[PDB]
Every structure is written in C-alpha cells, then in structure tokens.
Amino acid sequence: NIQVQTGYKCAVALRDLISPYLLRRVKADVAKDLPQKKEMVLFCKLTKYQRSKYLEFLHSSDLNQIQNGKRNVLFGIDILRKICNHPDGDPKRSGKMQVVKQLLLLWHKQGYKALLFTQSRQM
Amino acid sequence: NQEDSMIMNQSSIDRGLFRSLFFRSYMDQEKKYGMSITETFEKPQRTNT
C-alpha cells in the first residue's frame, strides 16, 4: 500500500534545503565543440551450450540448501555471467565473443577506433 | 582333535570338498564437486600425472 511519491517527498524535504549552499558550473556554456553522446544496448542470445550450462549450474548446485550468501552461491552470481565471458573454451561457444568478433571486423573495414569496456583483469 | 581342533581327510579336501567361490565388486564415477570440472577415467603415466 505505499507509494514512491511519499518516499520521494521525504527526500525532497531534505534535498531542497541546499539551495544557497549548492554551487554548480555547467557545461551548457562550455561544451561548445563536441558530438552527440549516443548509447544503445545489444541483445545477444545464448547458445544451446550456454543456455544449458548456466541452468545446469542452478539445477545441480542446490544453492539454497548450501544456504545463501555462501561462496559457491555467490560465485554462481558470477558463474552464470562467466558462461559467456569465459567458459574456460573457443569463442564459438560464446554468443558474446561472436558479437564482438562481428562488430570489430565490421569496424576493421570501417577504419573506426574502438574501445572495449571490461571491469576485470581475469577478463 | 582336542580343544575343538579337528583331523581331516586331505585327499577328500583335494577332491574339492567344501570349496567355495568368492566375489567382490567395485564402483566409481567422474565429474563430482565442481562446475564444469570433470575428473576422468584415463590411462595414467608418471609424466602424465
């Protein structure tokens, strides 16, 4: 029975007290020469191999009897992602590796510079 | 044949009297406790293991 707006109103009550104490310089009068900040999300689907294995981990590990917040349970959170990030394991077994492959080879011919974005040394 | 000892006919024993067979079984399996970590049955070697 509780609405977001009520919670928000409480946040408002505190937030809007900081008017004369808030200083802010904005790039509205600075960023006079830059391109459009474009973004999108890719929709990569799992292969038979990948789909079966991330589910198999969930079916065979029995994390809720191990109890939650345990090493293999929590590892499961990462493992279910690692099914496409690793698996250990040629890239033909990973839709993600195939998407990256295709995009970089496209840009290879386009002559585009490109960044890859990853939050892990193991990765 | 005292104190529960016995004297037996060796030639009857030689003839197979009271012989019996003995059987024993063994069993095993591969991938146990590890995700995608499959242990395996395969002929070993000291340089290979």
Contacts of A92 (CB under 8 A, 6+ apart): A98
- The residue ranges of DSSP E strands in chain A, in sequence order, are none
- B28 catalytic? Reply is no
Question: To which H or E segment does residue A65 belong?
Answer: helix A63-66
A82 burial (CB, 10 Å; 0-12 / 13-18 / 19+) is buried
Q: Are A44 and A95 in contact (CB under 8 A)?
A: yes
Q: What does the angle CA A102 – CA A105 – CA A111 come to, to the nearest 5 degrees?
A: 140
The answer to whether the Cα torsion of A12, A14, A19, A24 is positive or negative is negative
Give CA–CA dist A104/A112, Å, rounded.
9
B29 to chain A, any CB pair closer than 8 A? The answer is no
Nearest-5° Cα angle at A90, B34 to A74: 35
Residues of chain A in contact with residue B34, where contact means CB-CB under 8 angstroms, are none
Cβ neighbourhood burial of A85 (10 Å; 0-12, 13-18, 19+): middle
Do the beta carbons of residue A87 and residue A94 sit within 8 Å? yes
CB A61 within 8 A of CB A74: no
Q: Which residues of chain B make contact with A57, given a CB cutoff of 8 A?
A: 35
